[PDB]
Protein backbone atom coordinates (compact mmCIF):
# COMPACT_ATOMS: atom_id res chain seq x y z
CA UNK A 1 0.00 0.00 0.00
CA UNK A 2 2.30 2.72 -1.31
CA UNK A 3 1.20 6.23 -2.28
CA UNK A 4 -1.00 6.16 0.81
CA UNK A 5 -1.60 9.89 1.23
CA UNK A 6 -2.17 10.29 -2.50
CA UNK A 7 -4.77 7.52 -2.60
CA UNK A 8 -6.53 8.74 0.54
CA UNK A 9 -6.69 12.23 -0.95
CA UNK A 10 -8.01 11.05 -4.31
CA UNK A 11 -10.72 9.01 -2.59
CA UNK A 12 -11.85 12.19 -0.82
CA UNK A 13 -11.22 11.00 2.73
CA UNK A 14 -9.74 14.42 3.54
CA UNK A 15 -13.09 16.19 3.13
CA UNK A 16 -15.93 13.64 2.96
CA UNK A 17 -16.82 10.07 3.90
CA UNK A 18 -16.91 6.95 1.75
CA UNK A 19 -20.23 5.34 0.83
CA UNK A 20 -21.29 2.96 3.62
CA UNK A 21 -22.00 0.03 1.26
CA UNK A 22 -19.30 -2.29 -0.05
CA UNK A 23 -20.46 -2.11 -3.67
CA UNK A 24 -19.98 1.60 -4.32
CA UNK A 25 -17.07 1.74 -1.88
CA UNK A 26 -15.01 -0.94 -3.61
CA UNK A 27 -15.66 0.64 -7.01
CA UNK A 28 -14.28 3.92 -5.68
CA UNK A 29 -11.05 2.17 -4.68
CA UNK A 30 -10.51 0.84 -8.22
CA UNK A 31 -11.35 4.25 -9.72
CA UNK A 32 -8.05 5.91 -8.74
CA UNK A 33 -6.06 3.10 -10.33
CA UNK A 34 -5.39 5.14 -13.47
CA UNK A 35 -4.48 8.31 -11.57
CA UNK A 36 -1.93 6.50 -9.39
CA UNK A 37 -0.08 5.36 -12.51
CA UNK A 38 -0.10 8.95 -13.79
CA UNK A 39 1.16 10.52 -10.57
CA UNK A 40 3.77 7.78 -10.21
CA UNK A 41 5.01 8.57 -13.72
CA UNK A 42 5.17 12.32 -13.09
CA UNK A 43 7.43 11.82 -10.08
CA UNK A 44 9.95 9.94 -12.26
CA UNK A 45 10.64 12.83 -14.66
CA UNK A 46 12.74 15.03 -12.40
CA UNK A 47 15.85 16.48 -14.05
CA UNK A 48 19.22 15.87 -12.41
CA UNK A 49 21.21 18.31 -10.30
CA UNK A 50 24.89 18.20 -9.29
CA UNK A 51 25.42 15.60 -6.59
CA UNK A 52 28.35 17.66 -5.28
CA UNK A 53 25.95 20.33 -4.03
CA UNK A 54 25.05 19.37 -0.46
CA UNK A 55 27.25 16.28 -0.22
CA UNK A 56 31.00 15.90 -0.57
CA UNK A 57 32.04 12.98 -2.73
CA UNK A 58 32.86 10.10 -0.35
CA UNK A 59 35.09 8.46 -2.97
CA UNK A 60 37.48 11.41 -2.99
CA UNK A 61 41.08 10.41 -2.16
CA UNK A 62 41.09 13.10 0.53
CA UNK A 63 39.03 10.86 2.83
CA UNK A 64 41.44 7.92 2.61
CA UNK A 65 42.91 9.01 5.94
CA UNK A 66 40.34 6.87 7.79
CA UNK A 67 40.69 9.20 10.75
CA UNK A 68 38.98 8.23 13.99
CA UNK A 69 37.20 10.34 16.59
CA UNK A 70 39.43 11.59 19.44
CA UNK A 71 37.52 11.30 22.71
CA UNK A 72 38.06 12.11 26.38
CA UNK A 73 37.56 9.10 28.65
CA UNK A 74 35.81 11.02 31.40
CA UNK B 1 69.43 14.00 11.46
CA UNK B 2 67.00 16.42 13.13
CA UNK B 3 68.94 19.68 13.46
CA UNK B 4 67.71 23.25 12.97
CA UNK B 5 70.34 25.47 11.34
CA UNK B 6 70.69 29.24 11.76
CA UNK B 7 72.53 30.60 8.73
CA UNK B 8 73.84 34.11 8.06
CA UNK B 9 72.42 35.39 4.76
CA UNK B 10 74.23 38.71 4.66
CA UNK B 11 72.29 40.89 7.08
CA UNK B 12 69.36 38.47 7.45
CA UNK B 13 69.54 35.52 9.84
CA UNK B 14 67.84 32.69 7.97
CA UNK B 15 66.79 29.28 9.27
CA UNK B 16 66.52 25.78 7.81
CA UNK B 17 66.39 22.11 8.78
CA UNK B 18 68.84 19.35 7.92
CA UNK B 19 66.03 17.22 6.48
CA UNK B 20 65.87 19.71 3.61
CA UNK B 21 69.44 18.78 2.62
CA UNK B 22 70.40 15.68 0.68
CA UNK B 23 71.42 12.66 2.75
CA UNK B 24 74.98 12.78 1.39
CA UNK B 25 75.58 16.06 3.23
CA UNK B 26 73.43 15.33 6.29
CA UNK B 27 76.06 12.76 7.29
CA UNK B 28 78.83 15.36 7.04
CA UNK B 29 76.81 17.79 9.16
CA UNK B 30 75.94 15.16 11.76
CA UNK B 31 79.61 14.17 11.93
CA UNK B 32 80.51 17.74 12.89
CA UNK B 33 77.91 17.98 15.64
CA UNK B 34 79.19 14.63 16.92
CA UNK B 35 82.71 16.02 17.45
CA UNK B 36 81.49 18.99 19.52
CA UNK B 37 81.13 16.92 22.71
CA UNK B 38 84.55 15.40 22.05
CA UNK B 39 85.99 18.93 21.98
CA UNK B 40 83.76 20.10 24.83
CA UNK B 41 84.56 17.23 27.19
CA UNK B 42 88.21 17.33 26.16
CA UNK B 43 88.41 21.03 26.94
CA UNK B 44 86.75 20.44 30.30
CA UNK B 45 89.58 18.07 31.19
CA UNK B 46 92.31 20.59 30.37
CA UNK B 47 90.44 23.27 32.27
CA UNK B 48 90.19 20.84 35.17
CA UNK B 49 93.81 19.68 34.92
CA UNK B 50 95.52 23.06 34.56
CA UNK B 51 93.36 24.48 37.36
CA UNK B 52 94.20 21.65 39.75
CA UNK B 53 97.89 22.08 38.92
CA UNK B 54 97.66 25.79 39.79
CA UNK B 55 95.65 25.64 43.03
CA UNK B 56 98.10 23.08 44.47
CA UNK B 57 101.62 23.66 43.12
CA UNK B 58 101.44 27.48 43.10
CA UNK B 59 101.94 28.39 46.75
CA UNK B 60 99.82 31.53 46.48
CA UNK B 61 96.45 29.93 45.71
CA UNK B 62 97.14 26.91 47.91
CA UNK B 63 97.19 29.23 50.94
CA UNK B 64 93.49 29.98 50.46
CA UNK B 65 90.19 28.56 51.73
CA UNK B 66 89.14 25.36 50.00
CA UNK B 67 85.89 26.99 48.86
CA UNK B 68 87.83 29.58 46.85
CA UNK B 69 90.16 26.90 45.47
CA UNK B 70 87.26 24.66 44.44
CA UNK B 71 85.50 27.56 42.73
CA UNK B 72 88.51 28.19 40.50
CA UNK B 73 88.67 24.56 39.38
CA UNK B 74 84.90 24.54 38.89
CA UNK B 75 85.00 27.77 36.88
CA UNK B 76 88.05 26.77 34.84
CA UNK B 77 86.46 23.39 34.09
CA UNK B 78 83.34 24.55 32.24
CA UNK B 79 85.18 27.59 30.89
CA UNK B 80 87.68 25.25 29.23
CA UNK B 81 84.80 23.47 27.52
CA UNK B 82 83.16 26.64 26.26
CA UNK B 83 86.46 27.85 24.80
CA UNK B 84 87.19 24.56 23.04
CA UNK B 85 83.69 24.59 21.56
CA UNK B 86 84.36 28.05 20.11
CA UNK B 87 87.70 26.98 18.64
CA UNK B 88 85.92 24.02 17.05
CA UNK B 89 83.22 26.06 15.31
CA UNK B 90 85.18 29.24 14.59
CA UNK B 91 88.13 27.40 13.04
CA UNK B 92 86.45 25.89 9.98
CA UNK B 93 83.30 24.11 11.14
CA UNK B 94 80.78 26.93 11.53
CA UNK B 95 81.59 27.83 7.92
CA UNK B 96 81.65 24.22 6.73
CA UNK B 97 78.03 23.59 7.74
CA UNK B 98 77.11 26.79 5.91
CA UNK B 99 78.77 25.48 2.76
CA UNK B 100 77.15 22.07 3.25
CA UNK B 101 73.75 23.80 3.39
CA UNK B 102 74.27 25.29 -0.07
CA UNK B 103 71.19 24.70 -2.20
CA UNK B 104 68.84 24.14 0.73
CA UNK B 105 65.73 26.31 1.12
CA UNK B 106 65.81 28.80 3.98
CA UNK B 107 63.13 30.73 5.83
CA UNK B 108 62.97 34.11 7.51
CA UNK B 109 61.48 32.75 10.75
CA UNK B 110 62.28 29.52 12.56
CA UNK B 111 58.57 28.80 13.04
CA UNK B 112 58.14 28.57 9.26
CA UNK B 113 60.77 25.83 8.86
CA UNK B 114 59.20 22.42 8.12
CA UNK B 115 60.56 19.01 9.00
CA UNK B 116 60.43 16.80 5.93
CA UNK B 117 59.83 13.70 8.05
CA UNK B 118 56.82 15.36 9.70
CA UNK B 119 55.06 16.44 6.49
CA UNK B 120 51.85 14.77 5.36
CA UNK B 121 51.98 12.92 2.06
CA UNK B 122 50.07 10.31 0.08
CA UNK B 123 50.73 7.70 -2.58
CA UNK B 124 49.58 9.27 -5.85
CA UNK B 125 47.75 6.69 -7.96
CA UNK B 126 48.14 8.97 -10.99
CA UNK B 127 51.94 8.91 -10.66
CA UNK B 128 52.76 5.23 -10.10
CA UNK B 129 51.93 5.54 -6.39
CA UNK B 130 54.90 7.78 -5.71
CA UNK B 131 54.81 9.79 -2.48
CA UNK B 132 53.46 13.27 -3.12
CA UNK B 133 53.17 16.36 -0.94
CA UNK B 134 50.40 17.72 -3.19
CA UNK B 135 47.62 15.79 -1.53
CA UNK B 136 43.94 16.37 -2.20
CA UNK B 137 43.66 18.81 0.72
CA UNK B 138 46.39 21.20 -0.44
CA UNK B 139 45.24 24.63 -1.61
CA UNK B 140 48.16 26.98 -2.37
CA UNK B 141 51.68 25.61 -1.93
CA UNK B 142 54.78 25.97 0.24
CA UNK B 143 56.59 29.08 -1.08
CA UNK B 144 59.80 29.19 0.94
CA UNK B 145 61.91 32.34 1.18
CA UNK B 146 64.97 31.55 -0.96
CA UNK B 147 67.64 28.98 -1.78
CA UNK B 148 70.73 29.38 0.39
CA UNK B 149 73.96 30.29 -1.40
CA UNK B 150 77.43 30.10 0.15
Describe the protein's architecture and organization.
The structure is cut from a larger assembly and holds chains A (74 residues) and B (150 residues). Helices cover 38% and strands 0% of the residues of chain A. Chain A contains three helices and no strands. Chain A is elongated and about 65 Å long. In chain A, 0% of the residues are buried. Chain B is 46% helix and 15% strand. In chain B, the strands form three sheets. In chain B, strands 1-2 form a two-stranded antiparallel sheet. Chain B has a two-stranded antiparallel sheet with strand order 3-6. In chain B, helix 1 runs antiparallel to helix 3 and helix 2 (36-57) packs antiparallel against helix 3 (66-100). Chain B starts with a strand and ends with a strand. The interface between A and B is small, with 4 and 5 residues. The PDB classes it as membrane protein. Keywords: mitochondria, ATP synthase.
Brief account:
The PDB classes it as membrane protein. Chain A is an all-alpha fold and 74 residues long.
Descriptive keywords:
part of a larger assembly; 2 chains; A: 74 residues; mainly alpha; 3 helices; 38% helix; 0% strand; elongated; B: 150 residues; alpha+beta; two-stranded antiparallel sheet; membrane protein; mitochondria; ATP synthase; Fo-subcomplex; IF1 dimer
Say how many strands of chain B there are.
6
The profile of the biggest β sheet of chain A is: none
Shape of chain A: elongated
Count the E strands of chain A.
0
Distance between the termini of chain A: 49 Å
Kindly provide the radius of gyration of chain B, computed on alpha-carbon positions and rounded to a whole number of angstroms.
23 Å
Strand order of the main beta sheet of chain B, please? 1-2
Helix content of chain A: 25-40%
- Tell me, what's the shape of chain B? elongated
Classify the beta-strand content of chain A into a percent band. under 5%
Amino acid sequence: MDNYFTAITLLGLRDQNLPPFKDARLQRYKSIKKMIDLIETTTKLAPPMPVELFMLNPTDPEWDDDMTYPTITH
Amino acid sequence: SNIFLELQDGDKTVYTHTSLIEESKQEQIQAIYDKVPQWTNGGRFLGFWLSMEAVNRVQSVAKLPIYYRAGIVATSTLLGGLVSSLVFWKSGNENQVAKLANGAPVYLKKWEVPELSKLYFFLDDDNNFKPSLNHHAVTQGRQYYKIYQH
